[PDB]
Design a protein around this ligand. Sequence first.
Ligand code: GAL
Length: 141
Amino acid sequence: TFHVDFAPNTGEIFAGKQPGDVTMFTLTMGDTAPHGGWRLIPTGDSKGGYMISADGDYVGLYSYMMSWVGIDNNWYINDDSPKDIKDHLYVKAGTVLKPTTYKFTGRVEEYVFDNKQSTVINSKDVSGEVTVKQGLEHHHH
Ligand SMILES: OC[C@H]1O[C@@H](O)[C@H](O)[C@@H](O)[C@H]1O
């Protein structure tokens, strides 16, 4: 019953200084069965909550619905509802993007609370790449 859908967004991302907050990825997750909440752990090179250019540049991602705990290295939201959670990760206006591909890896865990603690009852590794286009080339001689 545990389902996860992590996907990059489609088309129209332009290299340069973003004029607004821009979704890079979207995440949909849900469960009818009893649960405590959800985290997304940014894994590997995404550790710290980042996207990674094949070149090696890191870009900071934010979560619209979840909160970030640096110490634990995850985004979480506590939710018990059997309703679908629709989050996405985005970069903040003013972020400079480069006309390249950016990877994101991490792991999505569902959890439970029995009294004092959380345990992982379900998990899914997730990844995604997002390709940023150049607009017009600009040639100055
Ligand atoms: O509210 C439960 C959450 O508590 C935070 O401290 C933790 O980093 C998350 O991973 C999740 O356990």
